[PDB]
Amino acid sequence: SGFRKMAFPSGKVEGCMVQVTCGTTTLNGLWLDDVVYCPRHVICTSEDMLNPNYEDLLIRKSNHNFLVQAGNVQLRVIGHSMQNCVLKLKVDTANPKTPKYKFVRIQPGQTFSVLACYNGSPSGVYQCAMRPNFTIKGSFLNGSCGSVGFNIDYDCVSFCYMHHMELPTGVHAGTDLEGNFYGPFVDRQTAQAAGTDTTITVNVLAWLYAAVINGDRWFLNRFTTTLNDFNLVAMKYNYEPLTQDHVDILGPLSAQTGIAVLDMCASLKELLQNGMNGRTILGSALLEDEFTPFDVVRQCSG
């Protein structure tokens, strides 16, 4: 029993965190085999950030301009290349602690663990989600750039996020491990702002199924709804549209609890209308959207 926002054990990722320094800038790198991956803005000054020409700034650098530190050991840089918004530093030592891994690009609504680091040293681990507006509501300070997001289903670490920047509203933007940004963001200090955020509907529904599994049914009603009527209502509360794919994905939880997806949708419709009236659901007074259908099955069942 119990339901917690649970992160993956961070050990496999801790053994990859290094510090990368170029001139006055110091940030985090991910050391996998003989390559260190880090945000390409490590080659920029604060001035450069307005309109940086990364190809021009990079061509002026040599291998010895990049200082890479793994614990108390300096790694030697023997090559460098840029792939989108990530700098790849070839080093002379393969990481002996390299876990089994994959680089995966996630979609909005997907969750992952973040190992927040400063000066190549891990300070904490937390669970979060890729928001529909492609930002993440993280907890990051100056120097956290290069911290990574991941999942560890089985013994394979799937790296899905690398931290690059903090937006004006305090939310965060970054790339997959191939350097492609999530969202319409650029690694440039420009007037860019997060789009209006919405609630991840399929995730709230999954969390309502988690409450049922844990013994809570107070929010259920005798009603059902069509998918289209549900979407017309949910859109008015800034909820993401629920697609047929979402309904399919919720099938296992629907079968385990005996509550049809569209009957759970009717309960969500009523919660949006009435609020909770002094009650909580799994210890929360708000509708939680940072647990996917997959996370619910993983935690409530094993």
Ligand X SMILES: C[C@@H]1CCN(S(=O)(=O)N2Cc3ccc(Cl)cc3[C@H](C(=O)Nc3cncc4ccccc34)C2)C1
Residues lying near Cl ion in the complex (CB under 5 A): 106-107, 110
Please identify which residue in the block is written with the tokens 């790198």: 29
Please identify which residue in the block is written with the tokens 């992952």: 112
The minimum distance between CB 164 and a copy of itself, in angstroms, equals 15
Minimum CB distance to Cl ion smaller for 182 or for 209: 182
Is residue 41 annotated as part of the catalytic site, yes or no?
yes
Which residue in 22, 145, 160, 265 is the catalytic one? 145
Which residue in 16, 38, 41, 128 is the catalytic one? 41
**What are the structure tokens assigned to 183, written together?**
């969202």
Query: In angstroms, rounded to a whole number, what is the distance separating the alpha carbons of residues 174 and 279?
Result: 37
Q: Which does 125 bind (CB under 5 to 8 A by kind): Cl ion, a copy of itself, ligand X, none?
A: a copy of itself
Which residues are near ligand X by CB under 6 A?
1, 41, 49, 140-142, 144-145, 164-166, 172, 187-189
Q: Which does 110 bind (CB under 5 to 8 A by kind): a copy of itself, ligand X, Cl ion, none?
A: Cl ion
Minimum CB distance to ligand X smaller for 43 or for 75: 43
Minimum CB distance to ligand X smaller for 212 or for 287: 212
Q: Which does 41 bind (CB under 5 to 8 A by kind): a copy of itself, ligand X, Cl ion, none?
A: ligand X
Which residues are near a copy of itself by CB under 8 A?
1-12, 14-15, 115-119, 121-126, 128, 137-141, 143-144, 166, 170-172, 214-215, 280, 283-286, 298-302
Please identify which residue in the block is written with the tokens 């979407």: 231
Instruction: Determine the straight-line distance between the first and last CA of the chain, rounded to whole angstroms.
Output: 12
Query: In angstroms, rounded to a whole number, what is the distance separating the alpha carbons of residues 152 and 13?
Result: 10
Minimum CB distance to a copy of itself smaller for 61 or for 137: 137
Q: Which does 107 bind (CB under 5 to 8 A by kind): ligand X, a copy of itself, Cl ion, none?
A: Cl ion
Query: In angstroms, rounded to a whole number, what is the distance separating the alpha carbons of residues 211 and 280?
Result: 10
Query: In angstroms, rounded to a whole number, what is the distance separating the alpha carbons of residues 56 and 26?
Result: 20
The minimum distance between CB 46 and ligand X, in angstroms, equals 6
Q: Which does 238 bind (CB under 5 to 8 A by kind): a copy of itself, Cl ion, ligand X, none?
A: none
Give the residue from 196, 164, 224 showing the smallest Cα distance to 27: 164
Is residue 145 annotated as part of the catalytic site, yes or no?
yes
The residues near 38 (Cβ < 8 Å, ≥ 6 apart) are 20, 27, 28, 29, 30, 86, 87, 89, 145, 146, 162
Minimum CB distance to ligand X smaller for 51 or for 228: 51
The DSSP line for 33-97 is TTEEEEEGGGG--TTGGGS--HHHHHHT--GGGEEEEETTEEEPEEEEEEETTEEEEEESS--TT
| Residues carrying an active site annotation | 41, 145
